[PDB]
């Protein structure tokens, strides 16, 4: 019994440590209300998920009954919804509010936080109906109270609300909520809330493959630049994916590499896996040879080994081997949603090989290119080089005599100037950096 | 209300007088309550059934009569009505073939976003089965990869709903595309080169080629005109962008 | 790095550590051959008196080293195949497909076709071994790999090189590094404002 | 050995002799400056201060 008692006492001590973390959060909001500073609010929201992975029904009920010294609708909602365990030997001195603290009404910020914390705790417990009810109460309270600092909270609140509704499969129904809060955020200039709601809407259109509506909304909805880093990364990745579906290739590669760089390197393992697969497929379709250093990703070895074989097949120009490996391990490609693109690469391998061999050779025979890339037909080789030149990916031309292709030339007026023309945005970066400094040099 | 659902549209409807009957159908049966909710009301489910039937009939009539405005209107109505997927209703039959024809003619209109997004709506409808709908996919795949004459022979048959006029409209798009590809950086174009290998053995297409675009026919040969030049560069837009940089870091 | 810190002919023991001083020298020769082609390598390793002595000790080693130095490909390719075979019998075989012979002949072909403009495939084949088709496929494979700055006129079977001028090639290097550092500064712009 | 300034055009059976302008060392010096002023600083500093 000694070992079990010691383990239970230790886990109760960690429960009390988590309760002290929640108490520190409450003190953080007391300070935030005192100082009118939402940045330290952002710190509280950043530090919540770190401790979110270990909570207990009993310690949550402890925090509820302690913080709600004055009777309130939050306590009345948590009393039936939160199912604390049976009697526990450990109790704490629950008296945080006395006198004026109990007399003063509850803070809307801490109310939104208790609601969001209850919904995250319900999802951790794998409950759905109580979580949706708490989230509805949260959005109702945030809509009713019209303070400026609340909408910054409302951004991540609506974010996680729609994430819950995605598990609920109410991800279609929550669209009305998303659009209503979008209109409220448009009224209140809530850029972060707007960013969150567009991210949730884009994930909804992804889960329903509603890509035509997604692109029609993205092409008209302006996304805030100064938004949160994570929301920016999610939005940019979704935009890159939909551009890849739309065949917007240069924009797709730009957006996907930007999203990979914007994502935290230490975290976002699933996001990283998705961006590796996206870059592999899209750049192989482009013929842009995939980055070899990316294969050293410790979390993507098994997923990229068939991707490595796909790269090898793209370079070689063979068909049967990669068709076999797709029949073997193409189900994950279908789950990722690139299998249509997978077949598109399977049949554009010849295009990519033609680009590479045209870069290799000056005047290559059409018969030679057909033999190299398994065309076995002079007319098909001529058609392929025609299609490459009309696409403008390469400079290989056609002379119906034998297949002549022009070579390069020495550097002209603009060939030395295009780098400076495309790179002199350095001073634009400098000026935005200086303006950010001007904004962020508060003295007190 | 629920009158002559396909009374004269199944066997043969070649007359123009049926336009008035269709208009009366729209006034009476198509405007009964709505097509949006589709919550219960199996009566409204059958209303959707008759709406999609009259839409396919109008699609066939429009593709046979070659009226772009009416055909596009019927296409948009078909898309908006099908926007309500109800799985319990019997799918396929009218779905895959009509969607294939619509997407193929949309590619003839040069739209690929809608094509691919519908393909993503259809995970196995396009790849596993339904040649009816993968025929446009195969045509686009060949026409993107390596084929012009092979694309023509592939177009020679439509498995979806026959109606072999989408192949002719894609043939018009590909005569335009071939004209562009030969207006590209090609070195020379013989008359027999333009006439024989690709397509259009001495039709009115030949006169169209000889009169519309440049590359005047030399001796049995069209040749590239002045498109690449040394261009002694006045270099004034570099000066303008330099001034733009100057003003950019002349302040703040 | 291995060469720069490994030419030092100061052994802790007369014949130990790397199994011999002769084995030490063979490692030096392999590392230098991977390292460079033919600049003042004459004044870097060839001038080495101990180097010349140990090449006297090992004739075949001296043979391929002098073959590379003299740029005589007819003996160079056979000696290079012998070198690859020897490296196979060696646990230091890490560059099994990258830098046994392919990198060395990339350097050799660069050296050869540079100071040349259009050297015929058929004659460069017999000046560089035999099998005109073998040399043609090797050139195609290496151009696809990226080096051997040239193109192949197949309809006439010519090797038309494209050597950039000093200005042109260095310009290309600067624009490449500008691409890399724009990537870097974009990552740093991500680092800021978050 | 860079003792001469030309390219052997065997196809034409000649050697095109070119006068190489060496004043273009500014190019290589600028590349060296780019390298040893950016690589040694950006990666180290903004990998040490990953969190900001």
């Amino acid at each position: 019994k000694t070992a079990a008692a010691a383990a239970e006492h230790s886990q109760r001590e960690l429960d009390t440590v988590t309760l002290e973390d929640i108490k520190e959060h409450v003190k953080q909001l007391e300070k935030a209300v005192s100082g009118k500073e939402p940045r330290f609010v952002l710190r509280a929201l950043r530090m919540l998920p770190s401790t979110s992975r270990r909570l207990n029904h009993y310690v949550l009920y402890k925090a509820v009954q302690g913080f709600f010294t004055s009777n309130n609708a939050t306590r009345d909602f948590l009393l039936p919804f939160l199912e604390e365990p049976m009697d526990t030997e450990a109790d704490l001195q629950f008296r945080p509010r006395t006198g004026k603290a109990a007399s003063t009404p509850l803070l809307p910020e801490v109310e939104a936080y208790l609601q969001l914390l209850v919904v995250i705790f319900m999802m951790n417990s794998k409950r759905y109906k109580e979580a949706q009810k708490i989230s509805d109460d949260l959005m109702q309270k945030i809509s009713t109270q019209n303070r400026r600092a609340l909408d910054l909270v409302a951004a991540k609140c609506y974010y996680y609300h729609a994430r819950v509704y995605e598990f609920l499969d109410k991800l279609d129904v929550v669209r009305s909520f998303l659009h209503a809060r979008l209109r409220t955020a448009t009224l209140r200039h809530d850029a972060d809330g707007q960013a969150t709601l567009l991210n949730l809407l884009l994930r909804n259109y992804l889960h329903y493959s509603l890509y035509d509506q997604a692109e029609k909304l993205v092409s008209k909805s302006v996304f805030p630049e100064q938004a949160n880093n994570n929301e920016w990364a999610r939005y940019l990745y979704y935009t890159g994916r939909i551009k890849a579906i739309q065949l917007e290739y240069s924009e797709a590669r730009r957006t996907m590499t930007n999203a990979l760089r914007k994502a935290p390197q230490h975290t976002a393992v699933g996001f990283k896996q998705t961006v590796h697969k996206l870059l592999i497929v899209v750049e192989l379709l482009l013929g842009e040879i995939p980055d070899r250093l990316q294969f050293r990703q410790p979390s993507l070895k098994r997923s990229l080994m068939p991707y490595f074989l796909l790269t090898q097949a793209v370079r070689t120009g063979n068909l049967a081997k990669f068709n076999q490996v797709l029949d073997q391990f193409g189900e994950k490609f279908q789950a990722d949603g690139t299998y249509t693109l997978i077949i598109r690469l399977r049949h554009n391998v010849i295009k990519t090989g033609v680009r590479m061999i045209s870069l290799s050779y000056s005047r290559i025979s059409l018969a030679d290119i057909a033999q190299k890339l398994q065309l076995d037909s002079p007319e098909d080789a001529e058609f392929i080089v025609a299609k490459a030149i009309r696409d403008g990916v390469i400079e290989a031309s056609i002379n119906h005599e034998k297949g002549y292709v022009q070579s390069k030339e020495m550097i002209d007026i603009y060939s030395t100037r295009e780098p400076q023309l495309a790179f002199h945005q350095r001073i634009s970066f400098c000026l935005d950096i200086h303006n950010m400094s001007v904004k962020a040099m508060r003295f007190p | 209300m629920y009158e002559q659902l396909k009374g004269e549209w199944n066997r043969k409807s070649p007359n123009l007088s049926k336009c008035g009957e269709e208009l009366g159908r729209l006034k009476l049966v198509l405007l009964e309550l709505n097509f949006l909710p589709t919550t219960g009301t199996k009566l409204t489910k059958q209303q959707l059934i008759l709406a999609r039937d009259i839409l396919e009939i109008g699609a066939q009539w429009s593709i046979l009569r070659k009226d772009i405005p009416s055909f596009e209107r019927y296409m948009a109505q078909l898309k908006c009505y099908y926007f309500d997927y109800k799985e319990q209703l019997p799918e396929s039959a009218y779905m895959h073939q009509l969607l294939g024809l619509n997407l193929l003619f949309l590619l003839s209109q040069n739209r690929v976003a809608e094509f691919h997004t519908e393909l993503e709506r259809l995970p196995a409808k396009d790849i596993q089965t339904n040649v009816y709908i993968k025929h446009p996919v195969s045509l686009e795949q060949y026409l993107m990869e390596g084929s012009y004459n092979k694309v023509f022979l592939a177009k020679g048959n439509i498995p979806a709903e026959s109606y072999t006029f989408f192949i002719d409209i894609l043939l018009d798009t590909i005569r335009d595309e071939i004209a562009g590809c030969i207006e590209k950086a090609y070195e020379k174009i013989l008359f027999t080169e333009a006439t024989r290998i690709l397509f259009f053995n001495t039709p009115k297409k030949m006169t169209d080629y000889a009169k519309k675009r440049g590359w005047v026919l030399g001796p049995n040969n069209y040749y590239s005109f002045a498109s690449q030049q040394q261009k002694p560069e006045d270099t004034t837009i570099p000066s303008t962008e330099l001034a733009k940089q100057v003003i950019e870091y002349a302040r703040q | 790095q291995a060469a720069e810190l490994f030419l030092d002919t100061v052994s802790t023991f007369t014949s130990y550590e790397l199994m011999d001083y002769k084995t030490f020298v063979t490692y030096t020769v392999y590392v230098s051959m991977i390292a460079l082609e033919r600049p003042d390598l004459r004044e870097k390793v060839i001038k080495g008196a101990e180097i010349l002595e140990v090449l006297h000790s090992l004739p075949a080693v001296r043979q391929y080293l002098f073959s590379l130095y003299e740029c005589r490909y007819s003996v160079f390719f056979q000696s290079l195949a012998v070198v690859e075979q020897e490296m196979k019998k060696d646990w230091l075989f890490a560059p099994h497909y990258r830098y046994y012979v392919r990198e060395m002949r990339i350097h050799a072909y660069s050296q050869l076709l540079e100071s040349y403009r259009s050297l015929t495939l058929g004659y460069m084949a017999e000046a560089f071994g035999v099998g005109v088709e073998f040399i043609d496929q090797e050139l195609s494979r290496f151009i696809a790999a990226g080096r051997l700055h040239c193109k192949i006129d197949k309809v006439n079977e010519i090797v038309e090189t494209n050597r950039p001028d000093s200005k042109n090639w260095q310009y290309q290097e600067t624009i490449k590094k500008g691409d890399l550092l724009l990537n870097r500064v974009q990552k740093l712009s991500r680092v800021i404002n978050m | 050995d860079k003792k001469f300034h030309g390219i052997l055009d065997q196809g034409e059976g000649v050697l095109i002799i070119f006068d190489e302008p060496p004043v273009d060392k500014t190019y290589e010096a600028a590349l060296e400056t780019i390298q040893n002023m950016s690589k040694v600083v950006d990666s180290l500093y903004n990998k040490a201060k990953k969190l900001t």
Binding site: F423, F429, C430, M441 | - | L188, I192 | I34, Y45, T52
Partner: peptide, 30 residues
């Protein structure tokens, strides 16, 4: 490459130093 980029990099260094200082001040004031 070497004046506009250098100005941008030095401005970035100043900004990120200021951001680190401001974040540390905000976290350790109380």
């Amino acid at each position: 490459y070497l004046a506009s980029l250098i100005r941008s990099v030095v401005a970035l260094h100043n900004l990120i130093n200021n951001k680190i200082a401001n974040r540390d001040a905000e976290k350790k004031e109380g």
